[PDB]
Amino acid sequence: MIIERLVGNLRDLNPLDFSVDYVDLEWFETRKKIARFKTRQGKDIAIRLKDAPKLGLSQGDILFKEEKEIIAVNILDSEVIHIQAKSVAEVAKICYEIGNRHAALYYGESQFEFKTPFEKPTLALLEKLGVQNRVLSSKLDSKERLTVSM
């Protein structure tokens, strides 16, 4: 089946009212408009999206919704550097240095927290700046991404 339009996002509804099948996406594939998947329940599903969200596909974005069945997007965990800034000035320094390296950056759960894909030089940079950071397996959700130019 080939889907051409998203139908919103699981946060807009009560998911327990529905059987939710997922398609698994890598964080770095979320900006694809044309792709094919096998859902976790083995359904053949493709996308050829006319107008995708500019941030890319987010967690819970709904590809298909009929009666009580949903096919929704899950973004796969990846190795992630989590950043804990301690001041507004630090937030500025960090984002500026990370932008200079052109590394992807995402907002974290709090206004002083950020996430970036694990890369050795990124790690080195933060350690160099003396910024508190953690390496974990986590989701890089498109809707949290800081835009390259948008």
User: Which residues would be at the binding site for Cl ion (CB under 5 A)?
Assistant: 76-77
Q: How many CB atoms lie within 10 A of CB 108?
A: 18
Distance (Å, whole) CA 22 – CA 41: 8
Nearer to a second copy, 72 or 125 (CB): 125
Distance (Å, whole) CA 60 – CA 112: 25
Contact pick of 17, 67, 120, 149 for a second copy (by CB under 8 A): 149
Nearer to a second copy, 71 or 82 (CB): 82
Q: What is the DSSP annotation of 26-84?
A: -GGGTT-SEEEEE-TT--EEEEE-SS--TT-PPTTBEEEEETTEEEEEEEPPEEEEEEE
Site string for a second copy, 63-92 (x = CB under 8 A): ------------------------xxx-xx
Shortest separation between residue 64's beta carbon and a second copy, angstroms: 32
Q: Tell me 1's DSSP state.
A: -
In three-state secondary structure terms, 106 is strand
Contact call for residue 98 and a second copy (CB under 8 A): yes
How many residues touch a second copy under the rule CB under 8 A: the total is 28
Nearer to a second copy, 129 or 135 (CB): 129
- Out of Cl ion, a second copy, none, what residue 76 binds, judged by CB under 5 to 8 A for its kind, is Cl ion
After what residues is the chain interrupted, C–N > 2.5 A? none
Nearer to a second copy, 70 or 125 (CB): 125
Residue ranges in contact with a second copy by CB under 8 A: 87-89, 91-102, 105, 107, 111-112, 114, 125, 128-129, 146-150
